[PDB]
Design an enzyme around this catalytic site. Sequence first.
Site, short mmCIF file in Angstrom:
data_model
loop_
_atom_site.label_atom_id
_atom_site.label_comp_id
_atom_site.label_asym_id
_atom_site.label_seq_id
_atom_site.Cartn_x
_atom_site.Cartn_y
_atom_site.Cartn_z
N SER A 1 -0.79 15.60 -11.99
CA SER A 1 -1.07 15.24 -13.36
C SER A 1 -1.32 16.50 -14.18
O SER A 1 -1.84 17.49 -13.68
CB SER A 1 -2.28 14.30 -13.41
OG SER A 1 -2.70 14.05 -14.74
N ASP B 1 0.82 -1.21 0.00
CA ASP B 1 0.00 0.00 0.00
C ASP B 1 0.86 1.26 0.00
O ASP B 1 1.35 1.67 1.05
CB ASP B 1 -0.89 -0.02 1.25
CG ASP B 1 -1.80 1.19 1.35
OD1 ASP B 1 -1.93 1.91 0.35
OD2 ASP B 1 -2.41 1.38 2.44
#
EC number: 3.4.23.22
Length: 330
Positions: free
Chosen positions: A199, A35
Amino acid sequence: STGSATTTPIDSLDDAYITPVQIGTPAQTLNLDFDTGSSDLWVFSSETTASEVDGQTIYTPSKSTTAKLLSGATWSISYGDGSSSSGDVYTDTVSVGGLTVTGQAVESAKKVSSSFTEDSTIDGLLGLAFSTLNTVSPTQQKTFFDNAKASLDSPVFTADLGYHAPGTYNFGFIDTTAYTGSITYTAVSTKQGFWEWTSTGYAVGSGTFKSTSIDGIADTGTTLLYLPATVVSAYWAQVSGAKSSSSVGGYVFPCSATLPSFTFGVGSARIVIPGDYIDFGPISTGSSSCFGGIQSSAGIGINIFGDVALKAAFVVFNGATTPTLGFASK
């Protein structure tokens, strides 16, 4: 040194991925959920409340000659999905894919929430976010990666998750045969303890690319892609009959649909998520309403590039002095 381990979807939907991890001496192999959005290595154990164990493999520290109680240490964690666990702490030898760390903090669960109990396939979590998020008190502990880093050939790990198929976590090297084209690297902020990046935009299907900054985290422990409501609405508007369902808890779509792809930007590069990756199947058995793999982050407080996004790429988690993230197509 290096390590390389195969990671395998837990079910037909790729709801999560499990990777075998050797703990203790002799080795006890547990299947952990790696994770990159948390920083605790915790396991089902011989200390876990018996009624909260249902099929998981447990770590028994009393059977490990290298286990040592970390005296006074406790831990307690709550995840974004509302699940939680807590317990005490041992140090022991932990190996992943041939890479060994001695003295790793292994957090033994005394209590786990129902979601964990109900998932027989996940024996615990192995956190790969920054050690500043580790919950051990009163002495915070380091992640497996943080402990291994100085010994690694290069201070990196990579995630290569499969779509409906196994994939690979590598430590200490970049497998140049595992991706196509080049890797595009992008800046990371560690201020919140995550692999947080920005992004450069998105496209829906064959549509034009929208240049817009989207801050979010690369999180292998989250199933879906969670993005701003504007972006998510633009995606689902291209699927006839798709709608946000408050009763179901997100966007659903007719199972008869063909889903468009979704592209996200990494610098000037583009990662394309095929439409099929966005299908999470019937909302309940036999239903013709299917659950979407792109959902709104509104009310989470952060955008999350979870498995839906990451499995479309070869992803480099570069833990150099100034960390960065790399993405390649594959």
